Amino acid sequence: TEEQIAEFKEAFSLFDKDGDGTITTKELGTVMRSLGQNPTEAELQDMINEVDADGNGTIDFPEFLTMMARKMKDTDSEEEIREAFRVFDKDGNGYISAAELRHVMTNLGEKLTDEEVDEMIREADIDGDGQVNYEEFVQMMTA
Amino acid sequence: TEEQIAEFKEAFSLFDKDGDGTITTKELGTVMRSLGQNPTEAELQDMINEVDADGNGTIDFPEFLTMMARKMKDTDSEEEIREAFRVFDKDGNGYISAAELRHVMTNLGEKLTDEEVDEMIREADIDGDGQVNYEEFVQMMTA
Amino acid sequence: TEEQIAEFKEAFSLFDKDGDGTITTKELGTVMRSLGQNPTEAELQDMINEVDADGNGTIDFPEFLTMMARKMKDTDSEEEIREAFRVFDKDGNGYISAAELRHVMTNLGEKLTDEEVDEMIREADIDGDGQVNYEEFVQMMTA
Amino acid sequence: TEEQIAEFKEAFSLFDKDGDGTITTKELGTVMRSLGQNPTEAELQDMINEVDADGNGTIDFPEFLTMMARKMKDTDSEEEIREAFRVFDKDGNGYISAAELRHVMTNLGEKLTDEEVDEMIREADIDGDGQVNYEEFVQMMTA
Amino acid sequence: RNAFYRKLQNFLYNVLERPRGWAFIYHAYVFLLVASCLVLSVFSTIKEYEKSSEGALYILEIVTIVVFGVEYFVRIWAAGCCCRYRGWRGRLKFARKPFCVIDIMVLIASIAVLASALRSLRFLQILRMIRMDRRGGTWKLLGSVVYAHSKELVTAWYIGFLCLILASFLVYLAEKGENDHFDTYADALWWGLITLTTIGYGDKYPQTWNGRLLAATFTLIGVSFFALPAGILGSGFALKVQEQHRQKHFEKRRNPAAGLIQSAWRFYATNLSRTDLHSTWQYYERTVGLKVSIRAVCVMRFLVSKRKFKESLRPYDVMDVIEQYSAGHLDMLSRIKSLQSRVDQIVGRGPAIT
Amino acid sequence: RNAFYRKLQNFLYNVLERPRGWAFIYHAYVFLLVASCLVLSVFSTIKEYEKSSEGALYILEIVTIVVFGVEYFVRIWAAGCCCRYRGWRGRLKFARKPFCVIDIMVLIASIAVLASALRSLRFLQILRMIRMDRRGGTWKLLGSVVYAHSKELVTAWYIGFLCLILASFLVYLAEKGENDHFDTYADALWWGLITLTTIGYGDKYPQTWNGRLLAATFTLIGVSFFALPAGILGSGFALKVQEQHRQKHFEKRRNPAAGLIQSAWRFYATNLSRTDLHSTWQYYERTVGLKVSIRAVCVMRFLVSKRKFKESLRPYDVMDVIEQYSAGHLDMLSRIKSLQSRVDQIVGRGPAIT
Amino acid sequence: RNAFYRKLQNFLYNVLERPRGWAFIYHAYVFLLVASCLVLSVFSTIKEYEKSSEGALYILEIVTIVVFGVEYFVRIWAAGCCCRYRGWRGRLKFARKPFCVIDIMVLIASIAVLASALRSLRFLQILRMIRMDRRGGTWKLLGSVVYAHSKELVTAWYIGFLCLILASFLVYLAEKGENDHFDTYADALWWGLITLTTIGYGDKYPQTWNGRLLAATFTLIGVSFFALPAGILGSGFALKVQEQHRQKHFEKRRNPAAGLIQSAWRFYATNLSRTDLHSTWQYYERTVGLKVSIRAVCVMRFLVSKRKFKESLRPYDVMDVIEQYSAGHLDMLSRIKSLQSRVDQIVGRGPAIT
Amino acid sequence: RNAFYRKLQNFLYNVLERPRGWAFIYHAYVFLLVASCLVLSVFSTIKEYEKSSEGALYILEIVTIVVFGVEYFVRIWAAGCCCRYRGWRGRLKFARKPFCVIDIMVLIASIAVLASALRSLRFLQILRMIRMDRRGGTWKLLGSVVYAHSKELVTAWYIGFLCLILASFLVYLAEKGENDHFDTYADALWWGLITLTTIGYGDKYPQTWNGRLLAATFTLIGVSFFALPAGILGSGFALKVQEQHRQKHFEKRRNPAAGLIQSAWRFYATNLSRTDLHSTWQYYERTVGLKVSIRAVCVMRFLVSKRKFKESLRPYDVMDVIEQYSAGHLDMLSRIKSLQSRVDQIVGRGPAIT
Numbered sequence A, B, C, D: 001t002e003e004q005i006a007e008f009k010e011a012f013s014l015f016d017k018d019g020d021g022t023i024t025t026k027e028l029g030t031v032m033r034s035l036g037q038n039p040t041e042a043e044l045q046d047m048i049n050e051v052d053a054d055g056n057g058t059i060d061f062p063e064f065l066t067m068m069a070r071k072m073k074d075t076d077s078e079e080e081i082r083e084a085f086r087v088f089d090k091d092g093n094g095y096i097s098a099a100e101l102r103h104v105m106t107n108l109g110e111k112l113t114d115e116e117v118d119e120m121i122r123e124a125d126i127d128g129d130g131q132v133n134y135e136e137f138v139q140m141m142t143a
Numbered sequence E, F, G, H: 001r002n003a004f005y006r007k008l009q010n011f012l013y014n015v016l017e018r019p020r021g022w023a024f025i026y027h028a029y030v031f032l033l034v035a036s037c038l039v040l041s042v043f044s045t046i047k048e049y050e051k052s053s054e055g056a057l058y059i060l061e062i063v064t065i066v067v068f069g070v071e072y073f074v075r076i077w078a079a080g081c082c083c084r085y086r087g088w089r090g091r092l093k094f095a096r097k098p099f100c101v102i103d104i105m106v107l108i109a110s111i112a113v114l115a116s117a118l119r120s121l122r123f124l125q126i127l128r129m130i131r132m133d134r135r136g137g138t139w140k141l142l143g144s145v146v147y148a149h150s151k152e153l154v155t156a157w158y159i160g161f162l163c164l165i166l167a168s169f170l171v172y173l174a175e176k177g178e179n180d181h182f183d184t185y186a187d188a189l190w191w192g193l194i195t196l197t198t199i200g201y202g203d204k205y206p207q208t209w210n211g212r213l214l215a216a217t218f219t220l221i222g223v224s225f226f227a228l229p230a231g232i233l234g235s236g237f238a239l240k241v242q243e244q245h246r247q248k249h250f251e252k253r254r255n256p257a258a259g260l261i262q263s264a265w266r267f268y269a270t271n272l273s274r275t276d277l278h279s280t281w282q283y284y285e286r287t288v289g290l291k292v293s294i295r296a297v298c299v300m301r302f303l304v305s306k307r308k309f310k311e312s313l314r315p316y317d318v319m320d321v322i323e324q325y326s327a328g329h330l331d332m333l334s335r336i337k338s339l340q341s342r343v344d345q346i347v348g349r350g351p352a353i354t
């Protein structure tokens, strides 16, 4: 709705320092640096082309609006997360102890800290078992 | 209906110069030459056997009637076009920018000109995205 | 029903010359010779074990009753005939000209004569096309 | 219900000689020896980890309660038994003579004696054929 | 009486033509006789053993010419029992084919010599030895394998030939005068060939350390590329024989499929409930309670042919199972399409009912 | 007491028969002893070292004959603990088999020599060396591989033999008089063989440029076809061992399947709700709160056997997964057929309700 | 008139560039001419045959230089008909590429020699022989195969080199003085190389029994590892050619897919019921009862292109069928998801109706 | 400042340890230096070139010892930057491992010689040459391949050894006195070995026609079985490297899967609608309109990681696709089970409604 558009206007002003209505790779890099993490120019280009519909080397506002507005259900992100969890579940039993998950997210890629893993497990251990099946997990993010 | 049969009579007279009720490979070749394109005698035989039910080296009228009358839905032409588009979609994402399609049809096989591609894209960009998914496309011809 | 049992009694008496209630391989061979064809003792054993539930080297009456009584639908003979026809349909189009079928049955295995092929094609060319699809055929025997 | 909990209390007291609320591998071994069979310490560890949710080298009472209480339907033990029977059915016909089954269970693994096989076949030969299909069998244990 | 005569003549035709069982043993024994003849001729070439070698070779040649003559006569006689060729005209027309001409020229040459002859005898032995094949299967297989791997074989030949030329020339330069072996570039080429192929006679070998170094550094690569084609052809032979086995398996599937379709049609037309269809009944009566017996026989035939065909539908390959199950999956697609249409009509009735 | 004796005798039978672990090491050590004996005999053949070689070989022969005698005696003793053969009659009946006869003839020959003997000793060593196999696995594998590739090997032999004959004859013609090496065609055949096989002794080699050219152009092809069979047999060995591994995997699947079925039936009959079925209860009581404990044990057995079998259902191959999933897909076909029937009954009720 | 001229010039460009049919035969015949030139040069190197060899080689060189000059001129002329390069400027710009420079240097060297020259002639022959490739396909294939198997080749080289060094050093120690062959370690290294590679010249071979024993025990392993790379490269060549065939098959699939999409769009826009879309109608009129004839032609084009594409969708591989059927299976997933949603709405209506 | 120092020290550790890019080139150049040293030593062994060979070898040895010393010092220094080993204690504890001990013994021996020495220098060169591996990958690969094909290699060895023994003994019998080459059985064994392996020195070769015949008939089979192991090991190497590639691919799949799960959880917790979950918000604030910007960044991270993981889910094999699609098919089974239950409840409601 209109308030969402206004929030998107404010956000775009925050990234779009030049105010040209396009998010340049330099603008994205500087805003990310303000956030703190240090990505690579090739990964910034990956950013763009993932979010860059018009292929202008930047981000027109409609792309940003659609990307913020899109929900995980709309993203069609079920099979991929399913396959990831299946990959991490060696036994193929459909379940995995929360301790192993805590270990993995704190050691792979964008390493996840203690509070985040506590939160995900709390939202996952609906049955209080620890051997969180990933079907309930995927339907949890989708729902 | 009857008017369709009359139109088919007129068409058959147009190809069947001999008036024998059969479309000979020579008659097909000359009518095509009048149309303008230049096919090969082997490809003309391919024509026949594709449309030649009786295997007489020609086309009896019922074959022509059925071939004109048949609709794309009756043709069972969904999986094949699906597979073609999937072949042209390298990413497997299910979508393809209309620019790539324009490039392909203007460069492969029976090369397609500007007006035809503009028309197909107009009939395809129902959502106005340019990244025409081929599911809506196939259901568009079928519908 | 009872009349069916009586007919089976008469048939069993016809094969079971010894009258022992069991169809010996010798009895089957002699009745077949009366029929005319000449099979092999190993193929006669194949006969038995196909119809021999009790594994006595003969055929107890219940086996014969069940075998006569069983209908093609009960036989679960859909996928096999489907696969056979698919094998004979090189194009994979799902259809085959009746001429090719006539040629095949008159040349392979228990070669089929003219009257039989005329009858099957008549019962198959419900649409009068000659390119009998085998789906209508299989559902025809099953029905 | 409560009576089930009381029965589980009695059983746990029977295994848990130490009375510590945990079934140690030694306690399991001695109770099994009282039963009569002689397993291996590695197989005892397999026992534990199969029933050991908390991974303490023993069995907390909730694990025992869940394991006794769980029913074969809850166990999700359909595909596995299906595959086992399919393995033992060389013909792939879906059926197997009860004599072969009697032979197998009396010769493989935890060899099964005469009374047990008589009982299973009685519960399996609902149609009185001997060629027990395993679909009725699996739905019999599940039901 | 004549039935047995024709049966035996057809069996003889089968034996001399494509054999299955112990006819392989007869072919192997005639092969043994010809091989004994070749070795006896080789020994007769030797001077010391010429006496006994020739003494045995004369009788062996008599026996072999007799055997080949009787075999050719039996072949021509049996050519007149097959469908294509019958009687005298058929056998004579069959003899017009080239292979029979090769055999008859061999026979007449053997008679002429047996009725500078050593070279003619050697050539005749070579011709008959290439003849024992009688079908050209080996040459067809080799040609197909070479054509399939034409690119690999051609690139291997190119690289190996270039390595041979280069290494030979460098060694020649390095041993122009310091070694008597490599006086001329032709000598160097001979050396390079007999090294890269790993024959290594030892008549020629570099003796200057520069030549030895060049020979080593080039012979490693050269022997590798010269050995390549052996493995390439081995793999090609294996793959080609596998493909031939697959084709034979598919034909063995084709035949019982027709058997099953025939038996199924016969059984369907054999139902006593319907009487409009009499073709199967007429056929069985012509071949000949009675009708139920005929139906019993025909349903048995259907059952046994179903067993035979289902057994004949064995995997033999991943591709085969994928193909069959994919036909099944397309059937699944059709069924789910029907279910979609049915649920659509249900949702259409919904508001109509409500 | 006797239980330990029978257990150890059965263990000895297993060790002398099919070994699994360190019995391989015992077999390898006896292999080392026999090999040392062979090399000592070879050295004793030499004249210079005959003294010390014989001095060591006498004691080595004593040790080896003692070891073989004790091994054969232990084998015959352990033959009387297996199910087929027991006691004295069983062991004697087992000795009636041919392999035991070969071993006993070897032993008695060793005793006779130890109680022109050089040739007999050599033959006895050869016989025992072929004996160490004790199962014929290598020969079975080689025969199976040759039979499987019979066509490829036969065509390779045909082409190679023809190339050998032709090249040898052409070289012989090209070097009839200009070279002393190729005086007779037998000499040429020997040369052609020792070249095409790439042995290349160097005793015979063409010296006329025509002969050298012919030898080159033919030896390329000849060495290729002569090397073919090595690669063919290597591939065959690999494939055959893979097939044997697949069969062993399927047997290892067979056993836990029976284990699971047994445990599942026991657990199903172990439910306390129903009392009509007592077979499992009687069996467990015979082997021997209590009943719930028995049910706990049996359900644990079901769980552990389910784990074991599910692990045992590993792919090991594409074909395996395709087969299992295709069984699942046929199940899918059945389920969709049921759904079609159900939607048909729904559409039938439609007009009935409406 | 000019149309035929341009067509023939383009055909010449195709012939000199990538050939398909009998242009292969022209390339093979020029290859035969160059090979005859090389063998004639080799013979001219020999002293005895120098006279006639040179007499023929002069005219052969004249013919070959003429042929190469005309071929290069035709190539440069045809460079001016392709899209990239036209007329004079295009041909000259194409000549700026390196391969044309190599060819022109070869031609000018041939002219200069034809207008210590033996070494220059040999080098020019080597250069042109490496030139006949004209595309570098063989070298690309070899490099790709080596890179793919870099680990296997490197480990084989490491093990073989270590075995060579060790065996050579041990033999050198065992034959330092007792054999004249192995006076220096370099001699031992040469011996070890010519043994492990199985060349076996015979100039050097151990004569002391210790040396013979060491040579045997090491040469088994050494020859095994020295033969490894041949088989490795053969397998690599086979796999690489299979991959290239797969890529070509996928391109041959790509083209008819576009053909089908074009024809399908044309046919869809060709329906007479709707008149808003005229693009196809305008195109066909520009190329030119009449309209129904156009629709007949276009629907025929759709049918024939559908046949062509469906044939083009042949398996060629397990992976291909798995990919296509997996797309179908994802479609199945979508359809069953829709059915789940529909049955959910049915169960929602249930209580609403009830 | 210190950050750059630690970064460069870690980079040095990576370079000396597992290299990726141009560190391969540094390793190859040090390999070139060591190889130049070995060849210079070989030449110094020769008498004629001893002068200049030694003159260059002294300076080359100086350079190589300097390079090896600096490399070992850098390795030990960089051992104190990895997680396991830090500072002085970590480096010293790392040096306790055996490979560092081998390197330090090599270095001290080089210093001692540089501060009958020829044999020590040769042994040190051999030790360092086996050292350049630094990881044992080649030996691990070879051992794994041998173990995998243990049965094929063992049967090939058995058959080849038996053929060698038998053919050698028969030739020895056939040439006991008529040939000086085969005076003793050891001589015959040497001949048989150097023939079957196809080395063919030519020092020994049968000269009696009986011996030649036996040698031919046995050498065909012998050379076939002696060549077997080369192809067997080549195939084994190929398969093992393929398996290693598959494992590396699966690890490369493992990592982005965790990346995607992390990003998905972060994005899910980043929704502004819910405020109970703050972990991701706190983490991003700690790392640091603003909140919507954070959500934009996190949803972008989810999208890009989804792209990366989906790309990482490439087939690489038939088995992989079968596994993934089979997981999908089990999902299909679950969904159709749910549909069956739903249609069952529909048919239950039927009579209830009706």
Ligand SMILES: C=C(C)[C@@H]1CCC(C)=C[C@H]1c1c(O)cc(CCCCC)cc1O
Binding pocket: E146, E153, E154, E156, E157, E158, E160, E161, E164, E225, E226, E229, F219, F220, F221, F222, F224, F225
């Ligand atoms: C029909 C066979 C056996 C193949 C294929 C046809 C050709 C031209 C020769 C055979 C062959 C060699 O016999 C040897 C090499 C190595 C290169 C030698 C340099 C001249 C390659 C090479 O393909």
Ligand SMILES: C=C(C)[C@@H]1CCC(C)=C[C@H]1c1c(O)cc(CCCCC)cc1O
Binding pocket: E219, E220, E221, E222, E224, E225, G146, G153, G154, G156, G157, G158, G160, G161, G164, G225, G226, G229
């Ligand atoms: C391009 C070819 C043909 C390969 C790959 C590149 C390399 C360095 C050599 C070839 C090759 C040999 O020619 C010989 C061996 C055996 C070891 C010999 C010891 C020095 C291995 C080895 O890879």
